[PDB]
Every structure is written in structure tokens, then in C-alpha cells.
Amino acid sequence: KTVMQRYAHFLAHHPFLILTLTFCANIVLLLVIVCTDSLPAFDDPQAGFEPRGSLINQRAQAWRNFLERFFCSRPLLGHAKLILRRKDAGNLLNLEGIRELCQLDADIRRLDEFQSCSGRLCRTWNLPNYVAVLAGKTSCHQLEEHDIRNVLNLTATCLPFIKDSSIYHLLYFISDKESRETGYSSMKHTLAVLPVWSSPAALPLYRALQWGNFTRPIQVIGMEMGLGDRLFNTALLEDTLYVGVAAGVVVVVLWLYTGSLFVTLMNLMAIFFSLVVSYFLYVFVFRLTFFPFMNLLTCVIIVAIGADALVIFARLWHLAKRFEKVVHATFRHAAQAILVSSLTASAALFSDIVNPIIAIRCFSIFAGLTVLVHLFFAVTWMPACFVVADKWGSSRQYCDYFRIFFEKLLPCLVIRLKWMWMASFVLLTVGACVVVFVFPGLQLASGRTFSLWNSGHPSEQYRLLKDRFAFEENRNLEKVSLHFVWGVLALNQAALLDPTDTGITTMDGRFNMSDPLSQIWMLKFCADLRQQTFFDNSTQSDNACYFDSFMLWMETGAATFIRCVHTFSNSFPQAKHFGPNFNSLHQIDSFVLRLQTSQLFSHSYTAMQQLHQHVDQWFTAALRTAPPSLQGAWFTGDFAFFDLQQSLISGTALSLIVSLFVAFLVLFFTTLNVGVSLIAITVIAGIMLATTAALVLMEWQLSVFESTIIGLAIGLSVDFTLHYAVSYCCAESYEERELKTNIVISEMASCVTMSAVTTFLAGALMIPSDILFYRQLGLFIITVTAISLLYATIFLPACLAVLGP
């Protein structure tokens, strides 16, 4: 408005002063934050997300309660490196059988070990161990291998797959399977050698990565413990740094391509960093706000938002081609789009904050702060453009393509001419999207406790494939893991979406085991829990309470509940009082617990969560039946993973609803005349769901990362649609028909093209830079981009649908 125009004139008058007032702020923020704390440093690679679903609290509580109270025959602790049935390892095994190349590679690794990660021992052996008894020789003839294979097969009696005297060799085989009957060949070689013994330090790990690159007979996979976590940290460091740098480069390239701005555009990128600085600053005061993925989404979001802003500025410059006053008016029009984008981002933050996840919450905060930062950036960017106008050059690229804009215009025209046809195509795509959500199915599960895939690093990727080949070689060192207990210490988690330990010592509502009431209550618990857990199988059937009453009735003694509890605690004859129990030791008190095995533990939570839910209901009914109904947290280790998945699903849904709120807020910010962009926003959301489904087409499993990506994507898509939205809004009054839609699409097409290029660049740079560390994020970004472009072409058909029939 007038005052807004006045601020614009204030900026125009301060084409340099205004810019300084922001660039300096960025610098100061960078310094203060750097000095105050080392925010860029990340404590851990793991997300550690807290589900917060009435069960996550119980789990955290159980955790807290428990916490309250010949030569070189290296063991498993020594970092093992096994390569089996691989093209690289295959060459090694074939040459080992012929020229003994594998043995030489192992020796070379030992030589590298002497330098670092080396009393020091030469090397553990799997294949060299067999012939080692006869003699240690790098020659490695075939006759020795044949004899070794014969003894390996002779060891079928002890383990089906002399021979007993080679006990150490037998252990070697245990470590290296599928090399006896199959033989020492390219087929499942399973190196399994220990170059370093008991070495989880980071420096040996770094050397291990290079060693894994066959820099020191080709070895495919190697492993390291403890050192693996350090490697993952290094992965987050180097890989994310590279992808981010590439992102900045692409953004700069795009800026020059669109606006041919060599300093102001660069200043926009620097402004993105400034924004990150502001976010970091404000967040630090309110909380730690640290998460690796938070940084990843931060860089991605910044790239996209800044891209949008630059797109806005460029659109204004194109419309420009008093002049400063009209420039200001264009600044206002674009400011609307900037505001729309910011709205999308902020609501995205709201989505990630609704579901409290140690990871999702941080991403949300970074997004929100960076978003408001992007708004101030929308201002500064405008100032940057103003300065560009104030000065061209030091004191030159024509940047013009023949009929390119016209070519896009014609593309918009063709899309518009077949308004009915394109509309049908989009609707069909929407139907296909919903179908995908149905079939194969929206819900997905992770294949393990930590994550379905938890190795983004290449060397770590080899280590993961090694983990699988190890599962083949060595048995995974699953069974049921339920454990009902006495109570809950703190149902409320660490205050406000904060990853922390709310309490250290347990707590429970003061309840006493009334001799007649409690014993029978525990007995009933044992009976029903027997019907659910025992399942006619032998596994921790005895209950710390019923067994106690039994031992007491057998001992016949020496207010029965208190005395009996005291006697049992004093005695604890069987299984040391069932291992952990009576955690209420601060004062003489009796606590209860029970490790059960009702159902098998499954990595996937499709049914594992079904079982946890069934058990949850059974426990709920049991608690209902109990007369004192004293709260007891019946948590299970598996219940935690199931909850993580449940929370991920809850977050996705809450995010979608939040997206509904985003669309509503957008139209509320962009719809005062007759009609509303809600129809369009809904179409966009459908496109977002379509993108999610497309990710499924990419087989991206449903995981925390997948969730965060779905959120950021909802944002990117909303911004894409925002342009067309504001346009249709403005054009309806002017022509109210396919003609208005044509012109609106004409102006929109430019924005669409720019945003498309921006997203494509960010996604491409990020996905290739990291081999699965953040590749899922880049792929998701690309998916969002594709769905966005599709939705872009369909955006205008939406307007057509808005036109009266």
C-alpha cells in the first residue's frame, strides 16, 4: 500500500544504505553466533527421534528406570573386513588361487596398518590361516587350498556345511563361511581378516576408508566398530559440505542465467547464508535446535526459497524493461509471492513441529526461522536489485536467447488450447496418485532397529553390504522382547519438543501392595499375561510376583505383602530376584516388572505394531480391571521401534493436515473476492500426494528422512502453485475466461520455468554429491520438482475448471 510504497521509496533512497543495513547484520550475526557457540558442529549423526505417542514416554521412562539402578588370532573386536561373491573380490579370489593376489593385498593392508592403526601383530587370517599351519607363504599354491577344503568338509560333523585339531582354523571358518563346500573362490570369498585389533578410534577409521578404496586382490567390503559412527560423522561432514557447495554454485549459475546479476545475485546467495545465520542465532537462544537433517533441509530449503525470491526479483526486472516507483510497485506485486512462499515454509515448520520428533522438530525450527529470514531477504533482495539498477558494471553479457521466451509462451499457448484435455490428464494423474497411496500402500516399514539403511557413506555403504554378507557369514549377534513394569516416572517428556532426559530416577504414584488386593491383582495379571505371553512356549514364564508368592508359600514364612516383599528381596534365591526388580530401593518399597515374550519381534511394524497395539489393548483392559489401577508402564524394546514408525506416520498425517492449513492460510492471504484458490490449493496438495507416491515408485521407504522430505516437498509444491494462484486471482477480474487464463499462464510460465530450473539444479547437485547420505533427500526434491512441473502445466487447467460451465 501507500506505506509499503513508502518503505519501497525508503529502500530506493537507500539503494546502498539499505543494503548495508542488512549485509552488516548478516556479518555480525555470523560473528556473535560463531563466538558464542560452535553451532555448526554436530554432536551426533543419529537422529534419536522421540515418538511422543503415549508409548514413547513409557519407553523413555523404562530406559530411565533401568538406568537409575596362532599368531594374531584376533576376536570380533578387531575390525573385520570381509569381501565375498563380488566382481572386485572375485578377481582377488581367482588371482589368490592362481597368483595369490588376495594374500598380497592382505599383506599390503598390514603394511598400511604399520603406518597407523597397527604388542602389534601382523594379521589375522581366514584363508591364509588354513595353509598357515602347514606354512606361512604369500605363494599360496593350490594343493594347500585343496587340503584345506578337505579338512573344512571334514569339519561337517562339528558344523555341517582330523579337522578337529584345526580348532583355531575352525573358528576361522566360523568367521568366514561359504568357503568350505563351495571352496575358496570368487563365490562367497568372505575375507574376514583383522588388520587392526581393538581399534575404534577415528584416525584408524579414516585410514580404513582409504584402505577400503583399494588404495593400498581388490577388496570389496571392510568393517569397523565405533569407528563406523565416526565415519558416519565424517560422512555428514564432507558429503553435506560438498552437496551444499554445489548447491550454492548452481544457485549462482541460475541467478546469472535469469538476471545476469554478478554481485547482487551473489549477494542473494550470501543472503541465504545470512538467513541461516539469523536462524541459527535466534534458535540458539530458544534451544539447541541441532540435527544433521535439520542442516540438510536448511540448505535445501534455503536454496529453493532464495531461488523463488530471485525469480520474483527477475520477474520484476522483466516487467521494468517514475521508473523507481514502478520498480517499487513491481516489488510489491512480487512481495506478495514472497509472502506466499514464506507462508508455505512457515506452515511446513508447523507441520514438523506438530509431531514432536527430535529430528522433525529441528527441521521445523530451522525452516521457520530461515523463512522469516527469507522474508527479510525478500526485502534485501529488492534492495540488491535496486543497487543493481543504481550501478551496472565496475564503473558484459547480452544474456538473450532467440525466441526462448516466445517458445515458452507458445508452450503455454498449446497447454492452454487443450484446456479440457490437459485437465483430464491431471485429474487422471491425481486418481493414480491416490491409487498408489492405496495400492501398493501408503504405509511402509523399516527393516531394522536403527534404520532400514543407516550407512550413507560409500565406505560405510560397503560396510553395510558387508553387514549383510556378514549376516550370511556370521549369525546376527530375533526373539520377543516385551517387558511390563511397575510404573512411569514422567509422562511429560523433556519440556517442549526438546531432546533431553526429563528425569534420571524413576517415579510412581504412591501405591501400596495391599496384602489381599495386590497379590490377587498380580496373580490375575499373571494369568492374563500367561494367556498372551506364555503361548505354550518356554521363555521367562515365571512372574517376579507369582514366583515370589510360590517361594514364600514353599518357605512358609519366617500385612503379608510388605513382609513378603522384604523377605523376597533379602532372599532373591532364583535368578537374582528375576534380574532387575524392586527398583523402589530409595526407601523400602516394592516395584514390579516382567520380561515377557508374547509374540515374535519383527523388523517391520506392519504387524509388529499390530501386535504392540493388540498388547496395548490387552494391557489397557487389564489396567481397567485392576482395583487400584495403579499406573504401570508396560513398555517393550520393540514397542519403541513400532512407536517410531507410528510417530512417523502420525507426523506425515499431521503434516498433510498442516498442509491443509497452509493452503487455507494462503487463500486467506490471497482470496478476498468471489471464489477462493482453495480448489487450486487442493489440486496442488493432490500433486504433493502424487509426488509422495512417486517416491514410492522410487521405492523410498517410509522413514524419518522420508517424512521430512515429504514435508519440505509440500512446501516446494505450494510455492510452485503460488505463482499460478496469485495470477489467476489477478486475471479473473480482467477477463474471467480462457483468455485471462492464457495471459495469467503467460506471466506464470516465466515463474514456473525459473522455479523448475532452480529445483532441478538443487536436486541434481545434492543427489549425486552424496551416495545415499542425503540422496533420498535430493531424489525427493527432484520428485517434488517433477510433480511441480507437472502440476504447473496442470495449474492453468485448474483455472479452466474455475471458469463457469
Author numbering: 11 to 79, 150 to 198, 205 to 247, 282 to 336, 342 to 446, 453 to 526, 561 to 642, 646 to 726, ...
Paper text:
Dispatched (Disp) is a 12-transmembrane protein that plays a critical role in the Hedgehog (Hh) signaling pathway by releasing the dually lipidated ligand HhN from the membrane, a prerequisite step to the downstream signaling cascade. They typically contain a membrane-embedded domain splitting into two pseudosymmetrical halves with six transmembrane helices (TMHs) each and two extracellular domains that are associated with the two transmembrane halves. In this study, we report the characterization, expression, purification, and cryo-EM structure determination of Disp from Hypsibius dujardini, a type of water bear.
The ones with higher yields were then combined. This yielded the construct (dubbed wbDisp*) that consists of residues (1–111, 123–530, 542–1116). To determine its 3D structure, wbDisp* purified in digitonin was subjected to cryo-EM analysis. WBDisp showed a monomeric structure with 12 transmembrane helices. It contains two pseudosymmetrical repeats with each repeat containing six TMHs and a soluble domain. The water bear Disp (wbDisp) has an overall similar structure with ffDisp and hDisp, despite that they only share modest sequence homology. By contrast, noticeable differences, particularly at the transmembrane domain, were observed between the wbDisp* and the published structures. Specifically, the inner leaflet part of TMH1, TMH3, and TMH6 shift towards TMH2, compressing the membrane core region, and this is repeated for the TMH1’, TMH3’, TMH6’, and TMH2’ in the C-terminal pseudosymmetrical half.
